[PDB]
Structure formats: C-alpha cells, structure tokens
C-alpha cells in the first residue's frame, strides 16, 4: 500500500486498515508511532486520496446532465401521463420509494404495472429491463398480470412493445420470514441485477413480515434485520441504477385511536427517499364500457382512489385521484 518507508511504523503499530486511519488526530498518530507531523500529515493525506470516491461536480452539471454518470437518475414511467407529472417524471432510479396504503387500495396493482413499464424502451418511459417481485404475503396474482399484459399489447400501437415477453422478465420470489427476505435481498437479487438485467426491485410487503414475534432479543433482531435489508436495498439502487419500491401497510386504527400512520417506525422511515400513500374513497366514477370492435354499451362505476405524497425531496404534499380498471392504474385529470 503506497510507500514502504513510512510503513515501517504503521505496519508495526497495529493499524493497517485504510478507514480506521482517518479517525484519529495527527498528534495521536505521533502517540502511536515515532513519526513526525510531517509524516503523520503525509500518511493520512495519501490514505484519504487513495479511497475511491465519486469526483467533485456542480449542481449545474447535474442539471445538464454532464458530470459523473453515476450521479444521473432516470425516470420510470407509471404508464399514465397524469401520474407521471404528479411525480415530476415518475419513479426515480437510485431511490427507495415506499408505497403505503390501506387494504385493497391498489398498492399491488401499481407495482405490477411498474413491472410492465420497466420493460418498455427508454424512449417510451421504461428502463429496458426486467423486474423482481419479492412476495411475503399472498400468492402472486398471475391472472391479473396476464390481463394487464394483454391489455397493454392491445392498446399499444407499436410492434416494439408487442414483441416484448413481459412474463419472461418478471421474477417472483417468496420470502416467508424476515431472515429469508434478507438473504433474498442480499444474495438472490444481486444475481438478477447483474446477470438478467433486472431494472426494478419490488418488496411486498416488508411490513407484513413484522408479524408477531415479540421477543426483545428478536425485536433487537427484527430492527437489526430492517437496517440491513433497507441499507442493502439503497446500495443496490445506487449501484445498478434501479428503483427500489417497498409496499407497506399503513397502520390506521391503533395510531389514530380517517387519518393514518405507516407501520415500520422511524428507523425505517429514515431510509425512505419518497413515501406515497394510497387510500380508498367512497366516491365512484361512471365510465362507459365499450370494448374494442364492439362499441360503448353502457356506464359502470369505478372506485375513486387517492394518492398522496407524504414526503419527498422534490414533491409538494399534494393529492391526486386515480382509478383501477382492466388496463390497470389510471390517473384522473385535476381537480
């Protein structure tokens, strides 16, 4: 590691890890080895310069976007122009987006839709890659996915999308317990990101695995596994330039003794870049059913749902209406 002459004191001084060196003071260096501030300064200067790190840039370069490439982010379309503008582009890569919401609020529908849009070419708002869907709860709704795929190929007027085999690039994993989920995220998922060009990670649901243990030794273990899984998710999102999306059940009735609070606590929240919440409303929207060669036949009711930005570095605390139908999740024009 660099020059051996100054080394004669630090190899003998029980400190050869580059990170540990940069913590203590130059006079404390003199305390451990018989070296001068001239050497103590030059020792820590070379160590700090040795550590590889993304280089300096300016916000103007990020805007242009003409700095280090690993600082650029990409937008994954939601498939709907109205939701995309609400999110100022859609799902951001190198971020952890949390989608919380009550039961049957559309969280799974939205995530399945992103498993389709991620495979579109970049010109159409995709990332040109597959998706891994980690299930901890029910069986995957394959019948519903195949319906959305067929509706997408039917409504797309470009052969480029029709010749995509969506089902072949969506990899479903099942994690039964918290420790297994950590193995899947830390060991299984990176293989998919490197070898099968997966461009989207979905976990549904991280909160469900926090089911019922209630041993403090496990509770320390439950929180220790959270930080590791959440940290690994962020590390993969940055390293492979992909969005990481976690579904979470918002725990309403206990915290609010219609207002709501997400489940996993503040330690989890500190990892979330963008947190969205989906809710159901009582209101319904009349929509005409028309099919394809057959024509408008009558009106049916769709449930009106809300999407809210609880926090995000770049979005206001806004709300937007949306629906779920055969095609999937569709925004509603304001307001």
């Amino acid at each position: 590691d660099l020059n051996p002459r100054i080394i004669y004191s630090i190899k003998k001084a029980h400190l050869h890890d580059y990170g540990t060196i940069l913590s203590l003071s130059a006079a404390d260096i003199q305390r451990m080895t018989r070296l001068s501030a001239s050497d103590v300064h030059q020792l820590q200067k070379t160590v700090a310069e040795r550590i590889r790190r993304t280089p300096h840039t300016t916000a103007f370069h990020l805007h242009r976007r003409s700095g280090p490439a690993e600082l650029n982010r990409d937008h994954l379309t939601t498939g709907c122009q109205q939701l995309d503008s609400f999110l100022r582009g859609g799902i951001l890569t190198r971020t952890l987006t949390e989608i919380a919401g009550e039961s049957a609020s559309g969280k799974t529908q939205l995530c399945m839709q992103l498993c389709l849009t991620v495979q579109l070419p970049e010109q159409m708002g995709g990332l040109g890659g597959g998706a891994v869907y980690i299930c901890t709860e029910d069986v995957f709704p394959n019948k519903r996915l195949v319906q959305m795929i067929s509706q997408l190929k039917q409504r797309a007027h470009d052969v480029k999308v029709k010749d995509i085999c969506f089902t072949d690039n969506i990899f479903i994993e099942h994690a039964a317990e918290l420790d297994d989920l950590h193995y899947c995220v830390s060991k299984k998922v990176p293989v998919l990101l490197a070898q099968r060009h997966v461009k989207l990670i979905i976990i549904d649901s991280i909160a469900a695995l926090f089911r019922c243990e209630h041993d403090s030794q496990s509770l320390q273990e439950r929180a220790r596994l959270m930080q590791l899984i959440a940290s690994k998710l962020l590390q993969l999102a940055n390293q492979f330039n992909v969005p990481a999306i976690c579904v979470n059940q918002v725990s309403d009735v206990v915290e609010q003794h219609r207002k709501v609070i997400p489940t996993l606590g503040i330690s989890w929240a500190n990892h979330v870049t963008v947190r969205l919440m989906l809710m159901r409303t009582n209101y319904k929207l009349p929509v005409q059913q028309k099919n394809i060669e057959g024509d408008v036949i009558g009106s049916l009711d769709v449930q009106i749902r809300t999407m809210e930005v609880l926090f995000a570095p770049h979005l206001p605390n806004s709300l937007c209406r949306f629906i779920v139908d055969q095609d999937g999740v569709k925004g509603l024009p304001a307001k």
Binding site: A59, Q227, S231, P313
Partner: protein, 269 residues
C-alpha cells in the same frame, strides 16, 4: 475579528433568521434535526442558494459545498428554489432602482446559482472522512466558499458499529474537524441529523447519542404541529428556547404568514 466572520446566511424566513441571530452564522456549526419530511434537505438547499445572494442585495455572495450522504439532492428541486431567489433579487433591483443591482442581475441567473453549488456524494462513512480530510486542499482553491452542508451527518453512522466508543471518537473527530474548517476558512457548517427513539410511550431524540452535539453552536429541531411546520431552537448561545412557524412552498423556505408567529419558552435560568 474581520467582517466576514460575523456574517450570516439568510434562510428566506425572517422568523427563522430571528432565532438564528440573523441567519446561519459563519465560523460556527449549525445542526438541523427532525423526523423525515420536515425540511432538513429543504433548508439545506435553501441555504446553498441563499449564500450566493450578491452583496448589493445584502447577501454573503459566496459559494456552497453540498455533501450528500443520503442521495436526496434532486437538482430539479434546487432549480425551483434558485428560480425563486433570482426572481426575488430581480424584484428588489426593480423596486430599489439601483444601477449596481441591475448590473448584478445581468450575471445573476438560475444557472449561475447552480454553478455555485459544489456537490459531493458520499456513500459510506469512510468516504466522508476521506472527503473532510481533503477539504482544506479544496477550500484553499475556492476561498469564496462560505457554506458546507452535510446532509446528513447521521446516516453514514447508523450501522452496527461494534465499538460505539469508536463511533463516538469518529463523530468527535469530525466535530473537531468541522469546527476547525469553520474558523480557519470562515464558512458556515450546516449539519443535518436524523431522529431516533429510546426505550430505556417511546419518544424521539436526536441521533448519535449524548456524546454528539457539544461542538454545535446552534441546534434546531424541525417538527410538525397540527399541519404546520415549526423550528424549535434546541441549543443556542442566547440559551433561549423558542419555536417559530415556517412553511415550505415551491419557492423554498418562507414565512408562514407575511408576517406571523411567536412563542416563548426557556430554561434555568
């Protein structure tokens, strides 16, 4: 001693500038703590913009270093705040009608503000020490830098440090490093910090433990009360304990009403 060591960086909230003593002070460490979404990154972006306000508008007219350890620095958001700051200065130049202000607006653009924000991305705590140690070489080459943001100081250290005493001297080594940078280069050091719980009704406290926060001159806690944001003056040289309301708009940090808001609270004594 000199006139630069007593300047302050405005937050665009005058209520906030009150409890801060006129702004975020140069040569000191200011710490911003709060739950997610309360505005730690928003205030960091605002200050990175506000430090560049030209002197003919009452600004420090410096540049900023933004050290992002979380990755929440979305430049599209900074463009919002930069645009609003330029529009505010353009308004002043039009009302006051001074020729120097009209000359400043020739070169005061949203893009120039973005160019005054030097951006560093750290992924682990080891990259942060490596950057802090190489900062003097960088600051000597950019002496116009008057603000260093670390957003956040807490995130790289939330790992399961086996020796928490090692984490303590890591944090104190940095706290001493930032104090030295603040005085030696006469710039403001803004540290953002996360909140955590304590079990031994669980309540929130600033992260990094009781050994952290001694080297910080000012410590703020941003928090929600009803549907309103507030800044509680946790630590200050005045020793007063004040809460002021503020808000976050498309323009950035602003006062909640033009103008409104005041409470009293204090300590012994």
């Amino acid at each position: 001693k000199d006139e630069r060591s007593q300047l302050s960086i405005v937050t665009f909230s005058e209520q906030l500038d009150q409890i801060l003593g006129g702004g975020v002070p140069l040569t000191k460490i200011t710490e911003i703590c709060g739950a997610p979404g309360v505005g730690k990154t928003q205030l960091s972006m605002q200050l990175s913009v506000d430090v560049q306000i030209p002197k003919c508008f009452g600004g420090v007219e410096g540049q900023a270093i933004y050290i992002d350890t979380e990755g929440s620095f979305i430049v599209d958001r900074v463009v919002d705040i930069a645009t609003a700051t330029v529009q505010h200065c353009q308004h002043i130049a039009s009302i006051e009608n001074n020729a120097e202000q009209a000359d400043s607006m020739q070169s005061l653009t949203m893009e120039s503000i973005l160019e005054g924000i030097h951006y560093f991305r750290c992924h682990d705590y080891v990259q942060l020490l490596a950057l802090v140690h190489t900062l003097p070489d960088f600051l000597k080459q950019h002496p116009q830098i008057c603000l260093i943001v670390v957003d956040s100081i807490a995130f790289p250290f939330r790992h399961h440090f086996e020796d928490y005493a090692l984490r303590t001297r890591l944090l104190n080594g940095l706290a001493q490093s930032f104090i030295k940078l603040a005085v030696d280069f006469k710039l403001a050091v803004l540290l953002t910090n996360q909140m955590t719980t304590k079990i031994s009704t669980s309540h929130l406290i600033p992260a990094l433990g009781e050994s952290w926060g001694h080297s910080s001159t000012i410590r703020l806690i941003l928090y929600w009360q009803e549907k309103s944001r507030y800044a509680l003056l946790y630590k200050s040289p005045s020793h007063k304990q004040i809460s002021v309301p503020f808000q976050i708009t498309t323009a950035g940090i602003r006062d909640v009403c033009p103008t409104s808001g005041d409470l009293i609270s204090m300590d012994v004594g």
